[PDB]
């Protein structure tokens, strides 16, 4: 399937134990896609002071379209030292590994895979 319905646990930035997916744009996009498939991917909602508490490169989910079955269509865009790899809509949040942190909410998304 080109798209997969996912429900992503929304984590508070200060709870997050593993604050990024790796060390290159290509690795973080790779790791993010693997964790999304394995159901081991969390979402942090981006506000003032969140991104400096996480590790670059960042992986964002961005709205790819204006929402089947409640699931917002999203795609992945990475960022490293102010350069983005991908072009998409509004940020829904930053992806991080989920290692059992308690979420505050779930974000229903349709991921272009």
Tab-separated table of C-alpha atoms in Angstrom:
chain	number	residue	atom	x	y	z
A	1	UNK	CA	0.000	0.000	0.000
A	2	UNK	CA	1.256	3.548	-0.877
A	3	UNK	CA	-0.411	4.792	2.380
A	4	UNK	CA	-0.731	3.253	5.888
A	5	UNK	CA	-3.189	4.387	8.622
A	6	UNK	CA	-1.186	4.992	11.824
A	7	UNK	CA	-2.085	6.313	15.307
A	8	UNK	CA	1.084	8.035	16.652
A	9	UNK	CA	1.580	8.479	20.418
A	10	UNK	CA	2.083	12.214	21.174
A	11	UNK	CA	4.963	12.599	23.728
A	12	UNK	CA	5.951	15.592	25.918
A	13	UNK	CA	9.488	16.684	24.795
A	14	UNK	CA	10.889	16.357	28.389
A	15	UNK	CA	9.738	12.649	28.599
A	16	UNK	CA	11.526	11.646	25.398
A	17	UNK	CA	14.439	9.242	26.128
A	18	UNK	CA	15.862	8.916	22.566
A	19	UNK	CA	15.795	12.402	21.072
A	20	UNK	CA	16.393	11.567	17.380
A	21	UNK	CA	16.805	8.776	14.821
A	22	UNK	CA	20.503	9.147	13.900
A	23	UNK	CA	23.261	11.220	12.440
A	24	UNK	CA	22.505	11.851	8.695
A	25	UNK	CA	19.394	13.058	6.790
A	26	UNK	CA	19.266	9.690	4.976
A	27	UNK	CA	19.618	7.681	8.263
A	28	UNK	CA	16.926	9.627	10.186
A	29	UNK	CA	14.408	9.286	7.269
A	30	UNK	CA	15.305	5.527	7.039
A	31	UNK	CA	14.987	4.973	10.826
A	32	UNK	CA	11.757	7.070	11.021
A	33	UNK	CA	10.164	4.926	8.250
A	34	UNK	CA	11.307	1.685	9.976
A	35	UNK	CA	9.870	2.826	13.429
A	36	UNK	CA	6.604	3.992	11.761
A	37	UNK	CA	6.244	0.496	10.161
A	38	UNK	CA	7.176	-1.262	13.529
A	39	UNK	CA	4.777	0.936	15.624
A	40	UNK	CA	7.765	2.268	17.668
A	41	UNK	CA	7.474	5.949	16.541
A	42	UNK	CA	6.256	8.876	18.673
A	43	UNK	CA	5.323	12.445	17.729
A	44	UNK	CA	6.340	15.646	19.551
A	45	UNK	CA	4.231	18.758	18.777
A	46	UNK	CA	6.539	21.656	17.826
A	47	UNK	CA	6.312	24.796	20.010
A	48	UNK	CA	8.840	27.451	21.160
A	49	UNK	CA	11.812	25.656	22.798
A	50	UNK	CA	10.950	22.076	21.640
A	51	UNK	CA	13.384	21.636	18.698
A	52	UNK	CA	16.546	22.755	20.611
A	53	UNK	CA	15.745	19.931	23.150
A	54	UNK	CA	15.832	17.326	20.316
A	55	UNK	CA	18.755	16.041	18.214
A	56	UNK	CA	19.318	17.031	14.552
A	57	UNK	CA	18.814	15.868	11.897
A	58	UNK	CA	15.040	16.280	12.659
A	59	UNK	CA	12.293	14.271	10.922
A	60	UNK	CA	8.967	16.143	10.521
A	61	UNK	CA	5.532	14.877	9.491
A	62	UNK	CA	3.977	17.545	7.246
A	63	UNK	CA	0.364	17.628	5.890
A	64	UNK	CA	0.523	16.421	2.216
A	65	UNK	CA	-3.177	17.160	1.332
A	66	UNK	CA	-6.417	18.887	2.660
A	67	UNK	CA	-8.277	13.468	5.769
A	68	UNK	CA	-9.619	9.914	5.158
A	69	UNK	CA	-11.353	8.209	8.167
A	70	UNK	CA	-10.025	11.014	10.517
A	71	UNK	CA	-6.385	10.287	9.384
A	72	UNK	CA	-4.517	13.410	8.058
A	73	UNK	CA	-2.340	12.562	5.015
A	74	UNK	CA	1.314	13.304	5.841
A	75	UNK	CA	4.794	12.777	4.421
A	76	UNK	CA	8.327	12.916	5.956
A	77	UNK	CA	10.700	15.941	5.573
A	78	UNK	CA	14.156	15.914	7.302
A	79	UNK	CA	16.039	19.050	8.462
A	80	UNK	CA	19.802	19.563	9.223
A	81	UNK	CA	21.391	23.018	9.948
A	82	UNK	CA	18.375	24.882	8.479
A	83	UNK	CA	18.115	22.842	5.228
A	84	UNK	CA	15.002	20.641	4.580
A	85	UNK	CA	15.024	17.521	2.382
A	86	UNK	CA	11.521	17.382	1.016
A	87	UNK	CA	8.780	19.898	0.403
A	88	UNK	CA	5.317	19.497	2.021
A	89	UNK	CA	2.612	21.364	4.014
A	90	UNK	CA	2.244	22.397	7.668
A	91	UNK	CA	4.238	20.507	10.372
A	92	UNK	CA	2.066	18.191	12.558
A	93	UNK	CA	5.190	17.533	14.711
A	94	UNK	CA	8.696	16.024	14.981
A	95	UNK	CA	9.110	12.212	14.997
A	96	UNK	CA	11.177	10.429	17.676
A	97	UNK	CA	11.709	6.807	18.695
A	98	UNK	CA	9.056	5.602	21.176
A	99	UNK	CA	10.574	3.387	23.922
A	100	UNK	CA	7.522	3.256	26.285
A	101	UNK	CA	7.003	6.920	27.288
A	102	UNK	CA	3.359	7.602	28.316
A	103	UNK	CA	1.655	9.732	25.630
A	104	UNK	CA	-0.647	12.746	26.223
A	105	UNK	CA	-2.683	12.007	23.029
A	106	UNK	CA	-2.730	10.115	19.717
A	107	UNK	CA	-2.427	11.711	16.247
A	108	UNK	CA	-4.234	9.708	13.477
A	109	UNK	CA	-2.246	10.039	10.208
A	110	UNK	CA	-2.217	8.445	6.742
A	111	UNK	CA	1.521	8.057	5.947
A	112	UNK	CA	2.701	8.136	2.307
A	113	UNK	CA	5.017	5.037	2.511
